[PDB]
């Protein structure tokens, strides 16, 4: 009787940026989704494919968890068939997504008096991102026709922009923690059932 270590990922002290989201693999344990579904502490709980109404009696081969931090206005962009800065340049989901996402407000931890500038996002890219693709490059973007030559100047901008978080900001400009769960199903023994 091994319990799935969900405490290490949901109750983690430090989270990752949206452009560098962390991925964790969970296997060979027993998971109780009823406790998570009855926490009354998550602002948003909406997902497609599987019904959250007590469907923990299913066996899956593996479970993958993705974590990142965004603001309130960009929470809607984390959904299949969505467009925006995040959906195109930072995190893209397939149209046939099979999983669930959990988001809650964390203004009491991630905010900082005077401004917290350690959270960044990508604003310039040559083309849209494919689903489940991670880009961590820091190459100087060429906006016009004059090559940047590795230096910043006219029509040469850094591809990353830093979030500005303050405790006095509005609800639409407050940090939010997002957790994404994915279920894999193959011709495998599928030891992850969680009765």
């Amino acid at each position, epitope marked *: 009787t091994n319990l799935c270590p969900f405490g290490e990922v949901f109750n983690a002290t430090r989270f990752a940026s949206v452009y560098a989201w962390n991925r964790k693999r969970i296997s060979n344990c027993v998971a109780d989704y009823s406790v998570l579904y009855n926490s009354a502490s998550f602002s948003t709980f909406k997902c497609y494919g599987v019904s959250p109404t007590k469907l923990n009696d299913l066996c899956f081969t593996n479970v993958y968890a993705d974590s990142f931090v965004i603001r309130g206005d960009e929470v809607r962009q984390i959904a299949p068939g969505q467009t925006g800065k995040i959906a195109d340049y930072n995190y893209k989901l397939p149209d046939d997504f099979t999983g669930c996402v959990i988001a809650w407000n964390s203004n009491n931890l991630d905010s900082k008096v005077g401004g*917290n500038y*350690n959270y960044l996002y990508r604003l310039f890219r040559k083309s849209n991102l494919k689903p489940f693709e991670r880009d961590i490059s820091t190459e100087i973007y060429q906006a016009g026709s004059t090559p940047c030559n590795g230096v910043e100047g006219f029509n040469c901008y850094f591809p990353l922009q830093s979030y500005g978080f303050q405790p006095t900001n509005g609800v639409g400009y407050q940090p939010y923690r997002v957790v994404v769960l994915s279920f894999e199903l193959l011709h495998a023994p599928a030891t992850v059932c969680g009765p």
Partner: single-chain antibody, 229 residues
Framework: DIQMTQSPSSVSASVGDSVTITCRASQGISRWLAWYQQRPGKAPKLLIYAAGNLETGVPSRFSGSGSGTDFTLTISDLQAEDFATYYCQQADSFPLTFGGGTKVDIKQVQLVESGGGLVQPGGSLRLSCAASGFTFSSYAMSWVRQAPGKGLEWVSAISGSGGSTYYADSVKGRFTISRDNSKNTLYLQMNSLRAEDTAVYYC????????????????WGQGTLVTVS
């Protein structure tokens, strides 16, 4: 303006006693605090970050608690290697402020610093911080100095790209900080030295990837002594 008051100033105990230390703040700092210990003749070592997050190498005998304004640190069993000086600092507003310190008595990454020396008052000096074994441009670097008989004091810091500069209130207009990404080195150019600028300067770094703000200090250098007379 955000100075932290640390009590008690000193405490004496035997082997097996329990010692508690209180660190207050002028205003709420949420969960931005750290604890350090410094043995005589050695650089400070981080023990607890955030509020109660134990370090991997520190034994589970050290515990911390508190949030907002009042913070406490407790030692379960006192041993012969637990006698040192402890400090508390905040990392949410600039400039960063350290604690007074508490005395307890018996009852991968490499950093090299050079450039310290004796100079006439009113002169100038330049210090260099050398870093290797990691991505230099992905971290923010800070300069910290300690008086020969006083506590720690935060001097200045530099951003990971070099576009942001932070200076203390007692060094503005006379000090300058810069970095060279190609040579993987950090610079500290200072002018108009006074007799009160004699201290051992340290080079600090944070374990987590921080690009704009230094926050905590996980790695420390060896230090250079500068004497003005």
């Amino acid at each position: 303006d955000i100075q932290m008051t640390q009590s008690p100033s000193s405490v004496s105990a035997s082997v097996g006693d329990s010692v508690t230390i209180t660190c207050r703040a002028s205003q709420g700092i949420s969960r931005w605090l750290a604890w350090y210990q410094q043995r005589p003749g050695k650089a400070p070592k981080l023990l607890i970050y955030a509020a109660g997050n134990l370090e991997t190498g520190v034994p589970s005998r050290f515990s911390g608690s508190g949030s907002g304004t009042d913070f406490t640190l407790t030692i379960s069993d006192l041993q012969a290697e637990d006698f040192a000086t402890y400090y508390c600092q905040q990392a949410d507003s600039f400039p960063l402020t350290f604690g007074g310190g508490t005395k307890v008595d018996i009852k991968q990454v490499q950093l090299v610093e050079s450039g310290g020396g004796l100079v006439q008052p009113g002169g100038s000096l330049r210090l260099s911080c050398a870093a290797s074994g990691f991505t230099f441009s992905s971290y923010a670097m800070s300069w910290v100095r300690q008086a020969p008989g006083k506590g720690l004091e935060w001097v200045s810091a530099i951003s990971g790209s070099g576009g942001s500069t932070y200076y203390a209130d007692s060094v503005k207009g006379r000090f300058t900080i810069s970095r060279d990404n190609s040579k993987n080195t950090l610079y500290l150019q200072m002018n108009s030295l006074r007799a009160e600028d004699t201290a051992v300067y340290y080079c600090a770094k944070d374990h987590l990837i921080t690009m704009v703000q230094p926050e905590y200090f996980h790695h420390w250098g060896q230090g250079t002594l500068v004497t003005v007379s």
